[PDB]
Amino acid sequence: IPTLYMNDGMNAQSSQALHIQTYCNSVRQQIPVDFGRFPNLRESERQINTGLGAARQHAEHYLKDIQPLIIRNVTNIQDYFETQNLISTVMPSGATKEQWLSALGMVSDKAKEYQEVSANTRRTIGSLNDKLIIDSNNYQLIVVNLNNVVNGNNGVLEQLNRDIDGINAAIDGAIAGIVVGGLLVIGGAIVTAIGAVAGLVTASTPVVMGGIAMMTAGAGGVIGGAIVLDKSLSAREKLYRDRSQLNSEVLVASQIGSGYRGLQTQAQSAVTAATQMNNAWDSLTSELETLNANLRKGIIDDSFLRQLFLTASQTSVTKVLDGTKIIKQQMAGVVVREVPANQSIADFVKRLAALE
């Protein structure tokens, strides 16, 4: 069972990591707000842009310091299972009990080192989640204050925040399912695009923060997922259209707030995936330590270990090794499309849906 927990952990963390990576890129592409036209909104502009700087730093911390740890974890799984296959192919024909005890000791020590890497990753994303919880909650105070400065209706603003939170669940879900479905496609790719979360007006700063599309490309390059994803992206754009009675600068502040909270939502999902991955390494190290103790105590013998390691090599190891190779290629091979300045993310995906 540890090998299947390992495989499920790797698939879930790898697919989620691509989603939070794209989300982070959307945060880093958000232009600072400009309330230059309204002099007594200067303090609200500074607070929001201070917030956006902090959000950009959190996104950069994920991209630069955490994503490489998730890829490393996949390499560690590969190296663990290659070492397990080495044991399985060299030791059953002739290895002594002494050699089996050393093998279990040395492979348990390597698994424990990989487990500790997974645990450091979990703690690092846990700390980032915690800072994002604090910062995204404090950010919402700025939006309420700005709504008060312009004598806005706080019931309309709260109804918009509740609606966007609701639709963000659907968008997050649709994207999670698209990336899960594409992760293990041989020769396939993940295609990404960043754009405005609401309809664009030529004559209000556009907000691309959490304005993401993720789709699949097969071996032949043909896009999948745009039709699926188009329903929720258009829904978000429609919920913002239905509150164009709200103050324009409040709307922008609110959209950045939903983006900041959405970045925290992604970080929470990354904690969950990292916890599942650490728990899967724990089950593997626990098994290997138990085998080592059981052999030393004469509760199992070399014949038991021959059976276990020959069966392991022939049953679920090949699927995990194939996965590590496909996952590394997919994570290195993400395709970015540039969205034209006059297309929202929903307009861009709708044009792709029309072609699928």
Residue numbers in the entry: 3 to 205, 208 to 360
Quote the passages of the study that discuss this structure, keeping the authors' original sentences.
As expected, soluble SmhB folds into the family observed β-tongue structure, with a five-helix bundle tail (α1, α2, α3, α6, α7), and a head domain containing three α-helices (α4, α5, α8) alongside a four-strand β-sheet (β1, β2, β3, β4), which includes the β-tongue motif (β1 and β2). The head domain of SmhB is largely hydrophobic. This is particularly evident in the β-tongue and helices α4 and α5, which together constitute the predicted hydrophobic transmembrane region (G175—L233). The crystal asymmetric unit contained two closely related monomeric AhlB molecules (RMSD Cα 0.56 Å) with the only significant differences in the tail domain, where α7 from chain A folds as a single helix with a kink at S320, while in chain B α7 is divided into α7a and α7b by a short loop region (T319-V321). AhlB and SmhB use both a short β-strand and a short helix connected by a loop, while SmhA uses only a short loop perpendicular to β1. The second region is between the N-terminus and β-tongue, which includes a family conserved glutamine (Q38 SmhA, Q32 SmhB, Q45 NheA) on the N-terminal helix α1 that forms hydrogen bonds with the β-sheet backbone of the β-tongue. In addition, both SmhA and SmhB contain a family conserved (conserved in all but 1 sequence) lysine residue at the C-terminus (K333 in both SmhA and SmhB) that forms a hydrogen bond with a conserved hydroxyl (T81 SmhA; T78 SmhB) on helix α2. As the overall structures of the soluble and pore forms of SmhB are almost identical to those of AhlB (RMSD Cα 0.64 Å and 0.46 Å, respectively),, not surprising given the high level of sequence identity (62%), we investigated if these structural similarities also conveyed functional similarities. The B and C components interact at a binding interface located around residues 95–123 of SmhB, this could break latches 1 and 2 on the B component, releasing the β-tongue, C-terminus, and N-terminus to initiate the transformation into the B component pore conformation.
Tripartite α-PFTs are members of the ClyA α-PFT family. Proteins in this family undergo a large scale conformational change from a compact soluble structure, where the hydrophobic residues are hidden often within a β-tongue motif, to an extended pore structure with the hydrophobic residues exposed in two extended α-helices which insert into the cell membrane. Here we show that S. marcescens has a tripartite haemolytic α-PFT (SmhABC), and propose a mechanism of pore assembly. We present the structures of the soluble A component (SmhA), as well as the soluble and pore conformations of the B component (SmhB).
